[PDB]
Short mmCIF file of C-alpha atoms and ligand atoms in Angstrom, two decimals:
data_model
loop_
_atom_site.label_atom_id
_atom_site.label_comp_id
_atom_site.label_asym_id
_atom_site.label_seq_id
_atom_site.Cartn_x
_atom_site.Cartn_y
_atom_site.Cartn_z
CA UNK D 24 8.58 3.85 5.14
CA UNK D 25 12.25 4.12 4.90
CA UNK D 26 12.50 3.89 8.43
CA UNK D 27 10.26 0.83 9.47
CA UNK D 28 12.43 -1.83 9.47
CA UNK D 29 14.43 0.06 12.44
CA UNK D 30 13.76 -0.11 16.13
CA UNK D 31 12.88 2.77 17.71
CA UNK D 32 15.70 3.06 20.15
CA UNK D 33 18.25 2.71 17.55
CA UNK D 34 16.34 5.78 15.65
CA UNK D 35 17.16 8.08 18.70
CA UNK D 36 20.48 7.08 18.81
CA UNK D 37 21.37 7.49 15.18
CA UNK D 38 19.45 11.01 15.77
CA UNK D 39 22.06 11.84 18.35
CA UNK D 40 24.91 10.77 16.42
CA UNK D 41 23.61 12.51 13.07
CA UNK D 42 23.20 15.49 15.43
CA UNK D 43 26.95 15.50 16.25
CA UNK D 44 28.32 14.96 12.71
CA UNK D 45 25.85 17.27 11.30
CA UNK D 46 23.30 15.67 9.24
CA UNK D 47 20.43 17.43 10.55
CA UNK D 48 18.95 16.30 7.13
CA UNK D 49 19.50 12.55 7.90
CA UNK D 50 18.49 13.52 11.96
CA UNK D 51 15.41 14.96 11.18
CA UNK D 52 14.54 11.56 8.88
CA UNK D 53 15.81 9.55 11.70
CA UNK D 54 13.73 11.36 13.81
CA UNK D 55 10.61 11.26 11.58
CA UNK D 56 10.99 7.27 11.46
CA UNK D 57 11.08 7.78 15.36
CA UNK D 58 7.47 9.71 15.71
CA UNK D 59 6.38 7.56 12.90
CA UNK D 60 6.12 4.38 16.06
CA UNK D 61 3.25 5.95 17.76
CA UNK D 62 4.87 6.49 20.91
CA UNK D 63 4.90 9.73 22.92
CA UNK D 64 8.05 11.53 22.79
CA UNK D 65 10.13 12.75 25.92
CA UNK D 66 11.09 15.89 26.33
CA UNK D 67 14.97 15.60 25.05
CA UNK D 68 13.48 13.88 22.24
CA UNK D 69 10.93 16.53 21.35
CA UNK D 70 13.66 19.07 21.17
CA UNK D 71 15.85 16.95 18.72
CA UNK D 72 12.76 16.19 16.79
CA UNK D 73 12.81 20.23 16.70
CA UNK D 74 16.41 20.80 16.44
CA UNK D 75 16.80 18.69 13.76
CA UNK D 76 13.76 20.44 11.32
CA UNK D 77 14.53 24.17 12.64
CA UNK D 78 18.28 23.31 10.93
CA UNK D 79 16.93 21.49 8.20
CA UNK D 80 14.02 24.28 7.55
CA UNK D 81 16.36 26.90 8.28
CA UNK D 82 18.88 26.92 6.04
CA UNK D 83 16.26 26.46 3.18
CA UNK D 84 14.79 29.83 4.36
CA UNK D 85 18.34 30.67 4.05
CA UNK D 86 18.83 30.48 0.99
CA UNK D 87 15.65 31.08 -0.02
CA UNK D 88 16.04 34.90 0.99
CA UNK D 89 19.62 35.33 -0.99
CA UNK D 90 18.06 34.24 -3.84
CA UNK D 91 15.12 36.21 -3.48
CA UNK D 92 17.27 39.56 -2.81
CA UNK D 93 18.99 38.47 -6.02
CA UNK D 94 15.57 38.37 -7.76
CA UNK D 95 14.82 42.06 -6.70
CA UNK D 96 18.38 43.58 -7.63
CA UNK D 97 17.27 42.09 -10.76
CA UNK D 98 14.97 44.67 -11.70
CA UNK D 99 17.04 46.35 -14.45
CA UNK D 105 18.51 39.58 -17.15
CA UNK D 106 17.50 35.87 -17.64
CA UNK D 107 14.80 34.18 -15.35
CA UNK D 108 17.31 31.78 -14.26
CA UNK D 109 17.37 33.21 -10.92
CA UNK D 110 13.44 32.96 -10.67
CA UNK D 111 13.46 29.32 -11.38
CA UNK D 112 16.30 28.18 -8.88
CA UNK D 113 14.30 30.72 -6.59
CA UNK D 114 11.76 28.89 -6.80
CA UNK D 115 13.27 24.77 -7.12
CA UNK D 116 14.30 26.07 -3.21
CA UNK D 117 10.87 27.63 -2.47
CA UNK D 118 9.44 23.80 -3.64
CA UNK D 119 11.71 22.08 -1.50
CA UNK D 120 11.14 24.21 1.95
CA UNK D 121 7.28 23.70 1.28
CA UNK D 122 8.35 19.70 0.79
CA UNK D 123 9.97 19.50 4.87
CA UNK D 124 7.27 22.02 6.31
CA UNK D 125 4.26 19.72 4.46
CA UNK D 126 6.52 17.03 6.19
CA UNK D 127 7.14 18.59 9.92
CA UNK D 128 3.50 19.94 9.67
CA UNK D 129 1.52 15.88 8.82
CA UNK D 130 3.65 14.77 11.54
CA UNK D 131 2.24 17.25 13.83
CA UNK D 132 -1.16 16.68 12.67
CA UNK D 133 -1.05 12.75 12.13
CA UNK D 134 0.70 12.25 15.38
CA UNK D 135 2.70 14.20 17.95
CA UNK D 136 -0.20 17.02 18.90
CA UNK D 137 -3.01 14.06 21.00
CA UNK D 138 -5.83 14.16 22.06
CA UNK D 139 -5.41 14.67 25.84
CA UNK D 140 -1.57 14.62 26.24
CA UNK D 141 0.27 17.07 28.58
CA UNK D 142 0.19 20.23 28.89
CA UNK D 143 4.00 21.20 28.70
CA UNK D 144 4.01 19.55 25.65
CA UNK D 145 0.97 20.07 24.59
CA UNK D 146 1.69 23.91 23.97
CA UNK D 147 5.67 22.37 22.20
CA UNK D 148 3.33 21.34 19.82
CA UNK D 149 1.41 24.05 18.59
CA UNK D 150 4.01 26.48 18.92
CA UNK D 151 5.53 24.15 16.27
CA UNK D 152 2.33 23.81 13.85
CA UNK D 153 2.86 27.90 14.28
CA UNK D 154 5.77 28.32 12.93
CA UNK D 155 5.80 26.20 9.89
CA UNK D 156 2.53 27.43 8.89
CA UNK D 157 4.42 31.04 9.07
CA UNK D 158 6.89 29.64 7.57
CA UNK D 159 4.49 28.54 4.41
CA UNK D 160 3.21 32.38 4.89
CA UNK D 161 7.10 33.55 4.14
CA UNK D 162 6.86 32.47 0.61
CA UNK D 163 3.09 31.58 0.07
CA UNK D 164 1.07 33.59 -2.42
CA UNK D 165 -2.93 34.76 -3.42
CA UNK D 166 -5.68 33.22 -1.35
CA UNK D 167 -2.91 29.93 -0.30
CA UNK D 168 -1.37 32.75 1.59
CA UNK D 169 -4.77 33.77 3.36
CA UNK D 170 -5.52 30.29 4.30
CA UNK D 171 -2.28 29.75 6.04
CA UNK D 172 -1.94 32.80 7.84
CA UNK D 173 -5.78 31.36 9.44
CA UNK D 174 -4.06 28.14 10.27
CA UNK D 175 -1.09 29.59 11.85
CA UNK D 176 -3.08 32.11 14.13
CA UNK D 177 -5.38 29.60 15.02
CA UNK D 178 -2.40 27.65 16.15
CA UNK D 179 -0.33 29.87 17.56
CA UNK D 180 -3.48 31.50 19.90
CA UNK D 181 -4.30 28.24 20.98
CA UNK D 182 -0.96 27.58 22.19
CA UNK D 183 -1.20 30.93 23.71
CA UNK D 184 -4.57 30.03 25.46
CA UNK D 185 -2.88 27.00 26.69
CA UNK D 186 0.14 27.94 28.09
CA UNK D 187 -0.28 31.30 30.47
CA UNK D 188 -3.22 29.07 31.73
CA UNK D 189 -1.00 26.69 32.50
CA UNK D 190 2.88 27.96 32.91
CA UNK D 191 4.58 30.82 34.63
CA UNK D 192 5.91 34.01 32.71
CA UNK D 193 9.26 32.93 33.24
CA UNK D 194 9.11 29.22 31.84
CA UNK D 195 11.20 29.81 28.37
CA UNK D 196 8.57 27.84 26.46
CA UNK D 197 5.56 30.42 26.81
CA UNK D 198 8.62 33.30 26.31
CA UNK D 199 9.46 31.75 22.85
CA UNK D 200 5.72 30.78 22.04
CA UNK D 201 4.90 34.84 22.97
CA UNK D 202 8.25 35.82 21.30
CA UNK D 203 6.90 34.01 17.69
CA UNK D 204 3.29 35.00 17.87
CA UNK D 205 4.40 38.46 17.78
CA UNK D 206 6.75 37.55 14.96
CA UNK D 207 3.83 36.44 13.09
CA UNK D 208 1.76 39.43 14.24
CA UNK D 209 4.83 41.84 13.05
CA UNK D 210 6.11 40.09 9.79
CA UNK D 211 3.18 37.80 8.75
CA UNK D 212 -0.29 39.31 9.52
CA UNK D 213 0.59 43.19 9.35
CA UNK D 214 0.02 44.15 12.77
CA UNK D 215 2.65 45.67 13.71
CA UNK D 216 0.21 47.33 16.63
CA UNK D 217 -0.26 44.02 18.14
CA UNK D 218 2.96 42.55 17.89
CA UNK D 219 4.41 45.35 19.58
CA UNK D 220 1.90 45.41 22.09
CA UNK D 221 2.56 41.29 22.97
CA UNK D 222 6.17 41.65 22.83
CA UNK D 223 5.78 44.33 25.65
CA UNK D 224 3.05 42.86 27.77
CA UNK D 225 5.12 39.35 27.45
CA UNK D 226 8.45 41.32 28.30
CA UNK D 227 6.80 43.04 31.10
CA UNK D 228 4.95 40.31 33.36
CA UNK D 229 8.18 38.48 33.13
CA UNK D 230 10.64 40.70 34.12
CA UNK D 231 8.39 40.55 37.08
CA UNK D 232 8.26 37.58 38.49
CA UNK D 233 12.10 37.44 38.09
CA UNK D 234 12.76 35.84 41.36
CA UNK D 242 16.17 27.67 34.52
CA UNK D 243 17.73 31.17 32.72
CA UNK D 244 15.18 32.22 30.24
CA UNK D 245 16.32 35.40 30.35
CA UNK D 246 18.19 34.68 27.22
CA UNK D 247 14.24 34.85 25.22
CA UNK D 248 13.39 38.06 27.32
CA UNK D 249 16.92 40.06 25.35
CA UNK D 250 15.54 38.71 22.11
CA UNK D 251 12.07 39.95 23.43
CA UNK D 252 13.42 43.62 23.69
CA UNK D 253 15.87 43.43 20.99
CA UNK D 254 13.05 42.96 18.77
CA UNK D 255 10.66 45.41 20.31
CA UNK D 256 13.85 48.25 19.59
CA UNK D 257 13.40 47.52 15.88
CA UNK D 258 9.43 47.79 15.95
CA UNK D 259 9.85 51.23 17.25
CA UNK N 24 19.31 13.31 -17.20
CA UNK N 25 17.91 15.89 -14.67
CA UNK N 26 20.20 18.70 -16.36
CA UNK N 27 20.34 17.67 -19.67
CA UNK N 28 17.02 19.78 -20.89
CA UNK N 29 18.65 22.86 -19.71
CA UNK N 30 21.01 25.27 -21.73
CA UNK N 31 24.47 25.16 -20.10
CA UNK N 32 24.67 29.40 -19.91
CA UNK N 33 21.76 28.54 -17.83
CA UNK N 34 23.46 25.72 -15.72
CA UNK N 35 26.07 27.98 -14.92
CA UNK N 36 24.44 30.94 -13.88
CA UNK N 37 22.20 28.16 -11.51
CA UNK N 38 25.43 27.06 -10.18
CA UNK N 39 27.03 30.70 -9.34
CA UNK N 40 23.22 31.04 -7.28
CA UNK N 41 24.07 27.75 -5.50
CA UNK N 42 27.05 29.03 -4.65
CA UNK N 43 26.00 31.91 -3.65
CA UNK N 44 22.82 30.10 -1.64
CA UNK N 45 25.43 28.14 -0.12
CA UNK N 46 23.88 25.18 -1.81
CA UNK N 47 26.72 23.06 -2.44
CA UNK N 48 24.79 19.58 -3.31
CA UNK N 49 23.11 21.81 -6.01
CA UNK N 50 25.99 23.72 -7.24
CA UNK N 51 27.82 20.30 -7.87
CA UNK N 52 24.72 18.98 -9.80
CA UNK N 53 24.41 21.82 -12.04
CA UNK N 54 27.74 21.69 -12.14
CA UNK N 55 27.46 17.48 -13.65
CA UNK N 56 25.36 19.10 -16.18
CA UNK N 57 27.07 21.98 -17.59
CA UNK N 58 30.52 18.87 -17.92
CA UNK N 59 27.71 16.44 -19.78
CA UNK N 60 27.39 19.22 -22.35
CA UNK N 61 30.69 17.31 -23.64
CA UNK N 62 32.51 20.69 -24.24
CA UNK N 63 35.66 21.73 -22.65
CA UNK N 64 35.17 23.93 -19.18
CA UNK N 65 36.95 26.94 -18.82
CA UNK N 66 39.12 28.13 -16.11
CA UNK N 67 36.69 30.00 -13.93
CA UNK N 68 34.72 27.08 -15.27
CA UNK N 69 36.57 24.26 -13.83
CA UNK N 70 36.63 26.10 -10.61
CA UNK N 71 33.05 26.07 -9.77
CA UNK N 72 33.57 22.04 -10.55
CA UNK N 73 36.05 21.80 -8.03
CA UNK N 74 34.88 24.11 -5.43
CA UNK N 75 31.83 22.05 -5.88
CA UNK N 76 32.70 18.72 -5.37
CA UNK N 77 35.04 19.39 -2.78
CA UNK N 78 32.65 21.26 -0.39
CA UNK N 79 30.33 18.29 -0.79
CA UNK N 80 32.54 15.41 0.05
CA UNK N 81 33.91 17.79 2.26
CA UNK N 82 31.19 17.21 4.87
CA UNK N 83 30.75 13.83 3.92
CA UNK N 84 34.38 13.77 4.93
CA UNK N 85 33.97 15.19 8.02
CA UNK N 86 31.02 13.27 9.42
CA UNK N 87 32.84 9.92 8.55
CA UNK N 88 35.76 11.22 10.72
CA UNK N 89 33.34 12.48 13.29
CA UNK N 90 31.94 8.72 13.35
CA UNK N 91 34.84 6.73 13.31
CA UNK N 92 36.25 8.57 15.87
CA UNK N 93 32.68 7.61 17.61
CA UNK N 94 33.13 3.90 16.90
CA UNK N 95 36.67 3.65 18.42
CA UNK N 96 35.71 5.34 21.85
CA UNK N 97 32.87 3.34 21.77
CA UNK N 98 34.93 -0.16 21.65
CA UNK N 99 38.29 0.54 23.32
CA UNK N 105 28.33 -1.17 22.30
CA UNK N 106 25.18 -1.36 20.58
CA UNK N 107 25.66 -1.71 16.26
CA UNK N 108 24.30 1.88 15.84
CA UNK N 109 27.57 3.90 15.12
CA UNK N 110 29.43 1.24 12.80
CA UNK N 111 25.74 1.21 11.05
CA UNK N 112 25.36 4.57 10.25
CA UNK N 113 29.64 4.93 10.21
CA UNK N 114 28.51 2.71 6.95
CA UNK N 115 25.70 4.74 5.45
CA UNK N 116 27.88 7.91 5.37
CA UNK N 117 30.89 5.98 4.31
CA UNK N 118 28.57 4.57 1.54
CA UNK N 119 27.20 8.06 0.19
CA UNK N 120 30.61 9.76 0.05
CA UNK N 121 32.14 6.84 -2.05
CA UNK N 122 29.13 7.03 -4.07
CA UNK N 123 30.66 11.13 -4.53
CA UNK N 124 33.72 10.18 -5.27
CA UNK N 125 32.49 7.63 -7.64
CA UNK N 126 30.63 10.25 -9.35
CA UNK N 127 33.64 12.93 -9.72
CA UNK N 128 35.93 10.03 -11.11
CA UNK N 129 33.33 9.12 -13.54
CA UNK N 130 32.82 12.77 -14.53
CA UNK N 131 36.72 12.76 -14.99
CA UNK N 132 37.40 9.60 -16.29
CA UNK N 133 34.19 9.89 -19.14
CA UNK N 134 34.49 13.69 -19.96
CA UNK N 135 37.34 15.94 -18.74
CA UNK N 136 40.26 14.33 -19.98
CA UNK N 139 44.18 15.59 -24.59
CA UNK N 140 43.64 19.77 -23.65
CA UNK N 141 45.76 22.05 -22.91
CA UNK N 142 48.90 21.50 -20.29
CA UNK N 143 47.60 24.09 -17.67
CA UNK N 144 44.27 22.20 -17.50
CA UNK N 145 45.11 18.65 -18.09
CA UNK N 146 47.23 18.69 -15.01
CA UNK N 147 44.39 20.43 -12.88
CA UNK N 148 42.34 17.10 -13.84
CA UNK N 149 45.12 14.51 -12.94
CA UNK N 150 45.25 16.56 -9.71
CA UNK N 151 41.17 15.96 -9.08
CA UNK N 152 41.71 12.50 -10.53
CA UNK N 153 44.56 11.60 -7.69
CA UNK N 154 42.39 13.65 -4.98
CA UNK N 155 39.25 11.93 -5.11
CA UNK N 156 40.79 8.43 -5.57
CA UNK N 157 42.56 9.18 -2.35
CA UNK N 158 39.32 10.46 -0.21
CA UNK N 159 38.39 7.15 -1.96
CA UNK N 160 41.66 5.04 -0.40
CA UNK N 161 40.76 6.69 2.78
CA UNK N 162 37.98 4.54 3.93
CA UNK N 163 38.33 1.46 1.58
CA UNK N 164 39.88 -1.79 3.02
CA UNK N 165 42.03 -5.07 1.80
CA UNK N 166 42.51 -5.47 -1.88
CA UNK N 167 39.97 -2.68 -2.36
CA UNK N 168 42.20 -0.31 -0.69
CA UNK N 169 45.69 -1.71 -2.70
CA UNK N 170 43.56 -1.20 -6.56
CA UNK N 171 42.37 2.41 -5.37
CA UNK N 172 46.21 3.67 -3.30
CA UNK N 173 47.46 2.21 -7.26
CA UNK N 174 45.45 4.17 -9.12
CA UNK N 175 45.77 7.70 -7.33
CA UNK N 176 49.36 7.30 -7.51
CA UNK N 177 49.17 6.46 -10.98
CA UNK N 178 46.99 10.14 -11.44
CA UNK N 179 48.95 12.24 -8.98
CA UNK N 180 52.14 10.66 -10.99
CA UNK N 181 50.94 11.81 -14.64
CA UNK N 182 49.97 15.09 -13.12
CA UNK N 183 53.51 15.77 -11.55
CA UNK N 184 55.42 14.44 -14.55
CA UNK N 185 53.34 17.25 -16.77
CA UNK N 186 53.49 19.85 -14.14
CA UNK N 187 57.31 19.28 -14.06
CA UNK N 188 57.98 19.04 -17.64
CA UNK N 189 56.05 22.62 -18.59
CA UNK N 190 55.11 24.43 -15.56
CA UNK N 191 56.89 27.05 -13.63
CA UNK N 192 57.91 26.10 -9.89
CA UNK N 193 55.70 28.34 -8.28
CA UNK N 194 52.77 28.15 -10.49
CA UNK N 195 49.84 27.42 -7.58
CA UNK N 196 48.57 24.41 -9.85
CA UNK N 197 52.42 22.64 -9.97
CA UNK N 198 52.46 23.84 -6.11
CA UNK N 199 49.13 22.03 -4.97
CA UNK N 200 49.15 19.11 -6.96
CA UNK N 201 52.70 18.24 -5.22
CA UNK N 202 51.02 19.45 -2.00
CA UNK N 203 48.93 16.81 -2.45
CA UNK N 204 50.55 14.45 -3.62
CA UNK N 205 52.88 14.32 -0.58
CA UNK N 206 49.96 13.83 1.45
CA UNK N 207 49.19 10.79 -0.42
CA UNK N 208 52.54 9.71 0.26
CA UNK N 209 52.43 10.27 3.97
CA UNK N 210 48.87 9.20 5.13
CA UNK N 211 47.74 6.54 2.45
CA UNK N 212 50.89 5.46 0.86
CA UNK N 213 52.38 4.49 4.38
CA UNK N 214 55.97 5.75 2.83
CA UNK N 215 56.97 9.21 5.17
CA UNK N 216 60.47 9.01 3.95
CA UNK N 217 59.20 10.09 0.20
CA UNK N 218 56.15 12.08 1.43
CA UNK N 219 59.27 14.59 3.30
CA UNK N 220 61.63 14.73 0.58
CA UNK N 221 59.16 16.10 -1.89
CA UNK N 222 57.79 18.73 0.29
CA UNK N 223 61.73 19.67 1.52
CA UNK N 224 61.72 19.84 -2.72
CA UNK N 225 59.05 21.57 -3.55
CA UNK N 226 59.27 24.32 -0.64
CA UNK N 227 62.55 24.75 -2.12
CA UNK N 228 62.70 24.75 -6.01
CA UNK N 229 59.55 27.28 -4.96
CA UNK N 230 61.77 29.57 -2.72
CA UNK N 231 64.01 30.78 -5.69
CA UNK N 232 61.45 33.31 -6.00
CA UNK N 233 59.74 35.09 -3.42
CA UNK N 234 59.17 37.85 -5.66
CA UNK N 235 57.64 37.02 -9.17
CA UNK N 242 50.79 36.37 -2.74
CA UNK N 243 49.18 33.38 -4.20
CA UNK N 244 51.89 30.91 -4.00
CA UNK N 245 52.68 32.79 -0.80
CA UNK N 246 49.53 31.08 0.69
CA UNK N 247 50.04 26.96 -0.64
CA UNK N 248 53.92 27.24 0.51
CA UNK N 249 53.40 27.91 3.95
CA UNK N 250 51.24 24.45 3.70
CA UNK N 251 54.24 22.55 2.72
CA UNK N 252 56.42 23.57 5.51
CA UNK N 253 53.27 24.10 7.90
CA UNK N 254 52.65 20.07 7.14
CA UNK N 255 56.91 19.47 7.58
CA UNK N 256 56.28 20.82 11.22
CA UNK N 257 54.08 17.61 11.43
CA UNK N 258 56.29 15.11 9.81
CA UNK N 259 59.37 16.03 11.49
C1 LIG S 1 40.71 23.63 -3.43
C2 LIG S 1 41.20 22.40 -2.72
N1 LIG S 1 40.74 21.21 -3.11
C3 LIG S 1 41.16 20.07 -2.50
C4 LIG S 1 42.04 20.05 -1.45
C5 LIG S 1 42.46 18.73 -0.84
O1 LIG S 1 42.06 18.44 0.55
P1 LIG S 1 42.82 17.38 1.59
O2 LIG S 1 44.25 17.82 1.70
O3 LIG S 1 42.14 17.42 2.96
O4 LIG S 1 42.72 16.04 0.91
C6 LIG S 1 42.55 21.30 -1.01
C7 LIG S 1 43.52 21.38 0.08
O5 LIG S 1 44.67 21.05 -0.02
C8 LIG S 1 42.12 22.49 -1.65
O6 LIG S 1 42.55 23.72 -1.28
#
């Protein structure tokens, strides 16, 4: 596409430096053009890739939820407000469509690795629940499917495969309950995966993931 | 024209959300609308249009200076910064471009207040402009702000009061101009010794309060 004409190496590069100035939205393109070659990525690479969406995807979600307070307090004026609400809504399905056909058309393969493997589906997890944030009527059921079935397999993957400690199968845990809590109303198993997850992990407390173990708890306060 | 099948109450209310959403790219393209309307824009008006623009080409400001500052370190190789030093540099110009148009085709002869705020934006973005352009590029653009910021001061002189924020800032400015484009730091420090003066003959009439300490603040720097 926009991105063919450039070698590969170059991509990464301009990634990095759009990462410095800023321009997560021209980093994450950079980096699409860069999965786009067909060549595995490493593991710094993998995390701009990331980086780059979770800011781009972020923000939208951002605003997304200030306009859709707005669009409650306006329950005693014009549906202005519904409209923009949902021009915004459009454009955060437009880069999770994106970040989720790169997933599928490339990154997660048929073998691979295992580390990364589980990057990957953790990944197709949360932009599927990130669809479910602001999906609707029987679209909404059939994501919710799609990110579960990710998600789980990730799960299955990775504490067959990694320690409780490694901060990849902490965040992977630490979303799935997310989705369990705020997406699939189950509030019964979220907390209940947030605490066995927080539990065999403090454990075997002998990298410094214990960063993902205070958002683990902080979360698990709220839940009860 | 994306806007143009929308009512401008509506525009404006979309803008105000951008704002509020922190949507800045928006805000300013709402903002292109409610101005193609062709009628005048009020005060509170004219200050989503700045507040707009500015946060826009703001970051597009920032990222060039990011870069550059790149490019130097990096040959004091590879073409990759002075590459993408160029696509950033390209979309902020085309900003700029945009805002002059706006000004130039549709804000331009109003009321004093108002017509000045304009010269001000007019100078502004034609320096932002000047500060990335090169050769006889640069010398037709560092003409034509001064011709703007010149205009502006001439009407915020002749019916404006010394410490009215719009007079204030648009001589701010304009001393910038005169240090950092116009290459002239003689004139740049004897119109901010001016202004922070024919401004301190009333400390009394918290506003003002906040553009003076700029003009000094900047003094610090060029002395
Ligand atoms: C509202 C507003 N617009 C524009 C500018 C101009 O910015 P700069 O001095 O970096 O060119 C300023 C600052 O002086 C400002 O406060």
């Amino acid at each position: 596409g926009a991105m063919g004409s450039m070698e590969r190496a170059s991509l990464i590069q301009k990634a990095k430096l759009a990462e410095q100035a800023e321009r997560y939205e021209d980093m994450a393109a950079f980096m699409k053009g860069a999965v786009e070659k067909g060549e595995e990525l490493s593991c710094e690479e993998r995390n701009l890739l990331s980086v780059a969406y979770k800011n781009v995807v972020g923000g939208q979600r951002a605003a997304w939820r200030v306009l859709s307070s707005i669009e409650q307090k306006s329950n005693e004026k014009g549906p202005e407000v519904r409209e923009y609400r949902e021009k915004v809504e459009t454009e955060l399905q437009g880069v999770c469509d994106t970040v989720l056909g790169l997933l599928d058309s490339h990154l997660i393969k048929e073998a691979g690795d295992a580390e990364s493997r589980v990057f990957y589906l953790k990944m197709k997890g949360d932009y599927y629940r990130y669809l479910a944030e602001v999906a609707t009527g029987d679209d909404k059921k059939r994501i919710i499917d799609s990110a579960r079935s990710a998600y789980q397999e990730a799960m299955d993957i990775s504490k067959k495969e990694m320690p409780p400690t490694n901060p990849i199968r902490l965040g992977l845990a630490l979303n799935f309950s997310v989705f369990h809590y705020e997406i699939a109303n189950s509030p019964e198993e979220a907390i209940s995966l947030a605490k066995t997850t927080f539990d065999e992990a403090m454990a075997d407390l002998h990298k410094d993931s214990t960063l993902i173990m205070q958002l683990l708890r902080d979360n698990l306060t709220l839940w009860t």
